[PDB]
Amino acid sequence: GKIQDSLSSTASALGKLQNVVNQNAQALNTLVKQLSSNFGAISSVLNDI
C-alpha cells in the first residue's frame, strides 16, 4: 500500500525512465531544428534556392 500512495504522490521516482524518453524527443527536436539552419548559404529553404 505504501508503494501505491508513493507512486500516487511523487513523480520523480520514475526519472530514470523519463530521462530516456525525453532525450529520444529532444535529439529529434534538434534534428528538426537544424533544418532552419542556413549553414552559410543565402537561404535555408530548398525551394527558395
Binding site: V32, K33, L35, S36, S44, V45, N47
Partner: protein
C-alpha cells in the same frame, strides 16, 4: 549625355569624413569631365540597381504567369507568389490576422498559406 561643351551637370562627392552607411544619400562635390572625346572608361555610363527585397511579406511586383483554378483534397505542385513546394491543400481554421499571409512550421518550412486571389487561409500537408 556627352555634349561637346562638357556635360558638367553630373558630379560626384570627392571627399567625406567617413564611409557612409549602405543606401545612404547626401568643395566636397566635383564635376565629371564628360566630353565626347573621352576614351572608354572615361565616358558617361548610366547605372540602374534593382534592389528588390523578398523576405516573406505581401508581394506586389512580379512577372507574367497565368494563375489557374485551385484544387483541394489532392496533393499537387504549388507556387504561391514565388513560394514553390508540393503538398495537399486543405481548408484551414487557423485564423491568420489580416496582415499574415504565410505560416511556417517548426522546421522553418511553410505549412499555411493565404491565397493571393481569394483571402482564405489554407493548410498544406
Amino acid at each position: 549625355d556627352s555634349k561637346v561643351g562638357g556635360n558638367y551637370n553630373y558630379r560626384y562627392r570627392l571627399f567625406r569624413k567617413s564611409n557612409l552607411k549602405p543606401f545612404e544619400r547626401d568643395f566636397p562635390l566635383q564635376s565629371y569631365g564628360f566630353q565626347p572625346t573621352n576614351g572608354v572608361g572615361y565616358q558617361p555610363y548610366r547605372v540602374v540597381v534593382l534592389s528588390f527585397e523578398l523576405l516573406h511579406a505581401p508581394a506586389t511586383v512580379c512577372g507574367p504567369k497565368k494563375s489557374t483554378n485551385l484544387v483541394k483534397n489532392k496533393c499537387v505542385n504549388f507556387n504561391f507568389n514565388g513560394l514553390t513546394g508540393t503538398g495537399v491543400l486543405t481548408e484551414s481554421n487557423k485564423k491568420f490576422l489580416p496582415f499574415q499571409q504565410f505560416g511556417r512550421d517548426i522546421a522553418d518550412t511553410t505549412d499555411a498559406v493565404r491565397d493571393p486571389q481569394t483571402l482564405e487561409i489554407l493548410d498544406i500537408t
